[PDB]
Structure formats: C-alpha cells, structure tokens
Design an enzyme around this catalytic site. Structure first.
Site, mmCIF file in Angstrom:
data_model
loop_
_atom_site.group_PDB
_atom_site.id
_atom_site.type_symbol
_atom_site.label_atom_id
_atom_site.label_comp_id
_atom_site.label_asym_id
_atom_site.label_seq_id
_atom_site.Cartn_x
_atom_site.Cartn_y
_atom_site.Cartn_z
ATOM 1 N N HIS A 265 51.375 35.968 39.554
ATOM 2 C CA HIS A 265 50.754 36.460 40.910
ATOM 3 C C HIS A 265 51.757 36.032 41.978
ATOM 4 O O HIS A 265 52.399 35.078 42.126
ATOM 5 C CB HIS A 265 49.477 35.572 40.735
ATOM 6 C CG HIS A 265 48.492 35.848 41.975
ATOM 7 N ND1 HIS A 265 48.953 35.261 43.392
ATOM 8 C CD2 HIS A 265 47.268 36.214 41.826
ATOM 9 C CE1 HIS A 265 47.871 35.742 44.066
ATOM 10 N NE2 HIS A 265 46.800 36.248 43.187
ATOM 11 N N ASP B 218 50.946 27.286 37.840
ATOM 12 C CA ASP B 218 49.703 27.928 38.625
ATOM 13 C C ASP B 218 48.672 27.978 37.596
ATOM 14 O O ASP B 218 48.586 28.844 36.623
ATOM 15 C CB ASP B 218 50.376 29.405 39.126
ATOM 16 C CG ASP B 218 49.184 30.356 39.299
ATOM 17 O OD1 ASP B 218 47.949 29.676 39.472
ATOM 18 O OD2 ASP B 218 49.708 31.358 39.748
ATOM 19 N N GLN C 38 43.926 30.550 37.046
ATOM 20 C CA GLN C 38 43.131 31.224 36.232
ATOM 21 C C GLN C 38 42.855 30.407 34.839
ATOM 22 O O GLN C 38 42.105 30.831 34.053
ATOM 23 C CB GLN C 38 43.859 32.586 36.095
ATOM 24 C CG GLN C 38 43.189 33.501 34.764
ATOM 25 C CD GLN C 38 41.899 34.148 35.243
ATOM 26 O OE1 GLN C 38 40.932 34.090 34.457
ATOM 27 N NE2 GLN C 38 41.702 34.281 36.503
ATOM 28 N N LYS D 112 37.351 30.113 42.143
ATOM 29 C CA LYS D 112 37.420 30.818 40.932
ATOM 30 C C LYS D 112 36.905 29.872 39.694
ATOM 31 O O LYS D 112 36.462 30.528 38.602
ATOM 32 C CB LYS D 112 38.874 30.556 40.147
ATOM 33 C CG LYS D 112 39.659 31.623 41.138
ATOM 34 C CD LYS D 112 40.681 32.510 40.618
ATOM 35 C CE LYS D 112 40.677 32.979 39.221
ATOM 36 N NZ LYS D 112 41.892 33.985 38.997
ATOM 37 N N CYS E 294 47.505 41.619 43.146
ATOM 38 C CA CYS E 294 48.772 40.555 43.538
ATOM 39 C C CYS E 294 49.829 40.345 42.525
ATOM 40 O O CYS E 294 50.298 39.245 42.420
ATOM 41 C CB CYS E 294 47.822 39.341 43.851
ATOM 42 S SG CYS E 294 46.541 39.481 45.069
HETATM 43 C C1 LIG Z 1 46.716 33.286 38.443
HETATM 44 C C2 LIG Z 1 46.422 33.159 39.997
HETATM 45 N N1 LIG Z 1 47.421 32.640 40.856
HETATM 46 C C3 LIG Z 1 47.293 32.400 41.960
HETATM 47 C C4 LIG Z 1 46.095 32.882 42.890
HETATM 48 C C5 LIG Z 1 45.937 32.553 44.261
HETATM 49 O O1 LIG Z 1 44.715 31.827 44.271
HETATM 50 P P1 LIG Z 1 44.038 31.616 45.615
HETATM 51 O O2 LIG Z 1 43.806 33.169 46.197
HETATM 52 O O3 LIG Z 1 42.665 31.025 45.302
HETATM 53 O O4 LIG Z 1 44.872 30.956 46.628
HETATM 54 C C6 LIG Z 1 44.930 33.613 41.994
HETATM 55 C C7 LIG Z 1 43.723 33.942 42.521
HETATM 56 N N2 LIG Z 1 42.933 34.985 42.171
HETATM 57 C C8 LIG Z 1 45.177 33.716 40.541
HETATM 58 O O5 LIG Z 1 44.326 34.362 39.584
#
Ligand SMILES: Cc1ncc(COP(=O)(O)O)c(CN)c1O
Ligand SMILES: Cc1ncc(COP(=O)(O)O)c(CN)c1O
Lengths: 412, 412
Positions: free
Chosen positions: B122, B199, B202, B225, B362
């Site tokens: 991401h 990270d 997810q 999430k 993203c």
């Molecule tokens: C794998 C992953 N990493 C990073 C993010 C970014 O997280 P946040 O938008 O909650 O800061 C997301 C959010 N959908 C995600 O799924």
C-alpha cells in the site's frame, strides 16, 4: 438571551453526583463536555452510514464522503476562511502547530532567521519551534509580558525584527485568561516580512473567529475543547502558503501519481490528509459547530464575560487567594491559596463534587514567570452558572478553614 | 463455532436497504462496521466520564485516564507485546509508518544504506520510505513478486544485503490477499543487520497477531479496519528501538522539563503522544478488541478462510472474470470482468445493494505489475455470509449479461 437551563439539559454528563455531591464541572479549558447533538451525530454515523470516503462508488461511501466534506465546509464558514482548500483536518491543535513547524519553518529557516514566541505560550506552541530553530540553526526569541500578563504592542515591535520569519502566539492563554491583540500582531509580523501563527485552541470554543479580520497566516484549533469529539482538530492556513508547503505526512489519499521512487501530491486540502481520515470525529465536529452557531458565539462570549467578572469579584472576597492575569479576560481563573498546594486544593474540591485543574497547565515557562511551581485553575463554558461559582468560592473558603485548622491542631 | 446470525445482530448498520435491496456490505478492507459494544462504549464515555487524562486530580479525570491507559493494556495483550511502553496510540497505520520513517529512518540512513520494500505495498508503506531515502541520499529497493503475487524467501535473501537498514513489508496485501512470510523475513532482515517494519493494517482485524513470534521491530495497525472507531491506530515498536528514537511530534503531554530553548521528554510510551490524545477513540478500540477476543481471532480467521475458498470457487464458475493473487489467501477477492471497467461494475453492484471497491486501492505500483489500470474488490469480515457471496456472483453474472446486451443493442 441564551437559556442556561435548556443548554444544560443537552449535556447528559452534567447530571450526576461525584462523592455524594452534584457534579460541578469547572475544567472546560482541560476539555469540554458534549451535547446530545454531537454524541447522536457519532451514533448515527456508526449506526447508518460509516464507509470509507472519497470513493463515492457505493451509497454508504457517498453518504460518508458528503458528511466528511460537509463538515469541512462547516469549519470554513465557522472561522470565515475563504476556501475549504485552507481547512486541513488534523488530530488536534498540537499536530496542527507541528505541521507548520515541520513543513513551513524547517523549510524556510536559515541561520540568522528568528522565530518569535511569548512567555505565556502553551507547550504545543513552544516545543515545535524549539526543534525547528535547532534543526535549522535559526534563533528563538520571546516577547516579554507586562505585569498583568498582557502583551504590549511596543514590546512586539521591539522583539520582531526584519530577520523574524515567524511570529507564533496564543489567541487566548489557558492560564492567564489574556486575549492577545492578534490582529495588531499580524500587521507587525507582516511589516517585518514574517508570517504569524495563531494558537487558537482556547479562543475558538468561546468567541467568534474571523481569520479574514485577524489576517493570521496559520490558525490552529482542537475539537475536544469546543463540544466536539476527541482526536480531531483543524489547521487553517492561507491558501498561497499551503500551496508552497510540502506535506508533513505521506501515504495513500494524499497522492496523485505514485511511481517506484517518486510521487506527486493531491491538490489542497487533501495534500495534507494522509491515510484514511478521522471520519466520524470530523462529522461530529461539524455537529458541534452547528450547535454552537445555533446558540451564537457572541452569546457564548457574553455569558463567559459575566461568569468571569462574577468569579473575579467573588475571588477578591476571599482572604489569602492570589489570582493571576488581567482584569479583562476569557472565562477562567487560575489562582493559588496562600500555603495550600494547588494539588491539595483540587483534591479537596473533588470531594465536594467540584472538578478543577492543578499543575503547570503545560505552561512551565509561564509558571517560572509567575514565580510559582503550580497553580489551580477553574474554567468556564456555556453550561456553567454563577451558582457553580458560588459553590467553588464557598468550597475554597472551607478548604482554607480546614487547612488552617489541621495546622493549629498539629501545633501540638 | 461462531454464530453469524448472532454476530450480525450486533451491527446495526447491516440492517437496511440501499436502492430497494438489502445492503450487502463487501468493503471491509476499505473500512469495517462497528458492533453496538463499540458504539455504546463511545456513548458511555461522552455521556458519563469524558475528561482530560493523566491528571487524575478529579473523579471523571481519573475514570477517563483509567479507560485510556486500560485500552493500552488491552492492545498490548491483543498483539502479545511485552510492555505498554511498546504501544503508541496514533491516528492510524499511515501515521504509525510515517513515525518510523521520520524518527527511525531519517536518523539512521546514510548514502549507501538500503530500504527494501515490495511491489505489493500500500502507499502508506511506500511514500514515507521514498521521502526518507530522498532526505538522506540512501537507496530504495523492491523485492520482486512471483507469478501468483507471493514473495519468495530467496528473492528476499537476494534483495536484502548487508547495506540494508530497513525492510518494510505488508503482513497481508489488501489487493492480492497474500499473507507474507513475515517471521522468515524478520530473520533475513536481522541476519543482514536490518530492522523489519510490518504494515499490519490488513492482518490485525482478521487473524491473531503475535509480535513475539513474528519478531517484528515495528508493527502498525488501524482501528477503523477492526470494528473500532475512525481516527485511531497503533505503532508497536521494540522497546529498545523506541528508547533511541526522538519524538515525531512535540508539545504538551510528551515533555518532562520545558526550558526557554531546550526540553526533555517523558518516558515511553508518552514520549510519542504529543498533545491531548484520542481519548474516546482509543477506549472504543479497547472495546473492539474485547469484542473480537470474545469471538476469537482463530474463529474469525477460520470463517474468512471458508468465505475466501467459497468465493474463489464461485468466481471460477463465472466466464470472463480474472481474479488476482494466490489460492491461499486472506478474506478478499480483487478481480476484473473482461471488457467492463471496474468502476462500472461497482456502480451496477451498488444498484443491487452491494458495496464493493473499484480503483487502484492505494497500490499503483501493484496495478502496473498486474498490468491493469484498476480492479474491483470484494472483502470479507466476521459479519459476512456465503449467501452474500452468492448475491455477489449472481450480480456479476447479470452485470456481464447486461453489458454484453447493451453492446449488441448498440451494434445498430
Ligand atoms: C494494507 C494497508 N496498509 C495501510 C493502510 C492505510 O491505513 P490507514 O488508511 O488506516 O492509515 C491500509 C488501509 N485500508 C491498508 O489496508
Ligand atoms: C492554548 C492551548 N494551546 C494548545 C493546546 C493543545 O491542544 P491539544 O492538546 O488539543 O492538541 C491547548 C489544550 N488544552 C490549549 O489550551
């Protein structure tokens, strides 16, 4: 022309006892309470339309987006900014001030440049500047205070020179109750080629903000102080300055193209909002703004002026109490009992149901200036009454009587 | 051994129609829904004990503090950290990852050092590293993917060298559904003298996290999430690394002594929490954790494995659908209909009540790797059912039928 009974009916948290006494909440400068309109706004969001924002591909997604960007417009009108592009949602005033220190200060400061602050500043409006001057080899200076804890414009003209790049100053001190001459300080800053950064955490909840009239370059506020959710605030910045600042934070949502090694940014305001944003909190901040606007900030200000003049009078009827700061003030009183540590004062008041603050109030340089270690503070908001100020001064009287007795009893 | 009907009863938002059809929410990777336990935790906080934290001088102040630090302990046990000192509350995974890039990377990277990421990351786990390598003149490298969107440990040993200072990698991809061999990647990183940054946005909602077993140096997650409030997340870092990092943000709450020009910091974790913190959100994240732990993360994981194997099977029964990523996967499916843009797919599904995602998710470098502009994605959580997957594949079938008809009808 506001009804305090009807206002108090909207705040569930007020209607309870602590230690057997009716709660008397006099700690709104630490954090404010929330009316039902705000709490139910969060409920409705999570119960009915929570979804991720800025996709608008499915119905809940669209509703969530409309609520979040709708709240941005409400903030814009609330402080009279020209454009939503100038309204960034952040975690709070502290983060907002750090963003300016990071993206503006650390990119525009060279040895020889000055950042000018004041001795009355909260830590939020001190430490980011200490770090930025240190990273850049610039110079930090301080505008002195007058004897009553106000700022002289002559002292501002003297401290601010043609090497000053940033003036950073509180709109309203959480300690002294001082309302600083922000508008006149903006002209002085501008005459020397500086920007002015306003810490408006303690003004925004309590009096009308007009960023056009103040002509401030940056202005920071916190939701939690103004009947809104925790965890959210705003950085306002003049659009032409924000356009030239790099983001403070990087990630999804705030990009346009991402290559392997290089990326481009979204336009304002999203450039400065990295990652999934504070969706429910910003929407509840919008609710808080609708609630305060429906009462009217001038009405709120008028109420607090009457509470503050009443409190100052009734404190001057107590023997052996020092009150700090000027006569003309925001809705709060910081003080000490002679010979009773403020921590003991706050502890004894809590036994009477009464919630105040004791300590340095995140203003350690101001405490040294006042020549004390700590003080106690009571702060007012739109739900507070003169009866509550009576209970406070009656309790301070009994606290004084009680500590004086213990001492005489311990003169065995 | 979990009852899906009883779980769905706890999520008010699920029980509504969109466009005349029962809502089918298949967008949990974008954001999850909240059970009553979480929403009522926020209500109770604002209705009964909101106050500023870490003073503990009055009763509500003490209750608020106990709730907030209580939530910290719940997070610690939830991911099996050794100490609350290793648990920092932030705005979200993005902010958490930016803190490491700022305080760790930008202080420990010299020309010649490598930061190694992967093509599946991401943006949150890409852009902070791009900026940090740029500020320090270091080098950014990428671990390649195999044909099914998994990572080979041999490719990791090849990309990671003795100049690598940081490995940064996703626990679970939001796009491919891949679960990366985090534990084995930590050993490789460590053998080369690197730290690994995970990270876990997810993974954390959907499977048991054990930072002791993963031996990750830093681990980032987002409340929104995992059935928790928006606006809050966690940075976990090994205590000995956090002790040597400087704060990312400066202000009240995170200081010990403030002089005119220099300041000292609080101990962990407060060193990294500047300003009034996300009080209600962190407490509601604690509620979310109690809720997920009472169902059991293994049970949640087991449910999602059954949804994902069912979905993969039923997608392979559709003609002209491509699914991306491996067979063994988290609870999601990203895909395209041949000749229907994913945006149109998501729009037509919403008309059927069905909420999915369309776009780059993203992960723009991953989209180029997949050789597409965009995809559609359905993602599952603990409230989703096989009936909902039937409605999804039935709707994709009709979407295909409908677009093929329009085309033949437009062959006039
Ligand atoms: C794998 C992953 N990493 C990073 C993010 C970014 O997280 P946040 O938008 O909650 O800061 C997301 C959010 N959908 C995600 O799924
Ligand atoms: C004048 C002032 N400035 C800054 C802050 C810091 O705001 P926050 O803790 O909401 O970031 C406060 C908070 N009480 C304040 O009163």
């Amino acid at each position: 022309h506001m009804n305090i009974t009807d206002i108090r009916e909207q705040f569930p948290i007020l209607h309870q006892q602590v230690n057997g006494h009716d709660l008397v909440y006099l700690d709104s400068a630490a954090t404010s309470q929330k009316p039902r309109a705000v709490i139910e706004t969060l409920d409705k969001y999570y119960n009915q339309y929570n979804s991720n924002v800025h996709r608008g591909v499915h119905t809940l997604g669209t509703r969530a987006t409309d609520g979040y960007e709708g709240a941005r417009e409400k903030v814009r009108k609330f402080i009279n900014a020209k454009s939503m592009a100038e309204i960034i949602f952040t975690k709070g005033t502290t983060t907002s001030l750090n963003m300016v220190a990071l993206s503006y200060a650390r990119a525009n400061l060279k040895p020889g440049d000055e950042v000018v602050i004041t001795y009355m500043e909260h830590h939020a409006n001190i430490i980011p500047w200490q770090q930025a001057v240190k990273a850049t080899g610039a110079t930090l200076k301080y505008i002195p205070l007058q004897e009553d804890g106000t700022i002289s414009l002559e002292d501002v003209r003297e401290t601010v020179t043609s090497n000053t790049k940033i003036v950073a100053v509180s709109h309203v001190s959480n300690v002294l109750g001082t309302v600083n001459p922000i508008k006149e300080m903006a002209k002085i800053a501008h005459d020397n080629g500086a920007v002015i950064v306003v810490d408006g955490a303690q003004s925004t909840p309590h009096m009308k903000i007009d960023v056009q009239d103040l002509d401030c370059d940056f202005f920071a506020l916190s939701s939690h102080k103004m009947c809104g959710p925790t965890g959210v605030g705003v950085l306002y910045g003049k659009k032409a300055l924000l356009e030239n600042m790099e983001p403070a934070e990087f990630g999804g949502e705030m990009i346009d193209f991402v290559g392997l090694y290089e990326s481009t940014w979204k336009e304002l305001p999203w450039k400065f909002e990295a990652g999934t944003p504070i969706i429910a909190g910003a929407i509840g901040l919008g609710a808080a703004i609708d609630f305060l606007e429906e009462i009217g900030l001038d009405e709120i200000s008028r109420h607090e002026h009457k509470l503050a003049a009443y409190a100052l009078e009734r404190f001057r009827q107590l023997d052996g109490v020092t009150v700090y700061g000027p006569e003309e003030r925001a809705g709060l009183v910081t003080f000490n009992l002679d010979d009773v540590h403020p921590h003991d004062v706050a502890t004894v008041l809590d036994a009477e149901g009464i919630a105040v603050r004791a300590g340095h109030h995140c203003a350690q340089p101001l405490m040294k200036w006042l020549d004390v270690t700590a003080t106690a503070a009571a702060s007012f908001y739109l739900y507070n009454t003169e009866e509550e100020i009576d209970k406070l001064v009656e309790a301070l009287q009994k606290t004084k009587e009680y500590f004086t007795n213990v001492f005489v009893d311990l003169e065995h």
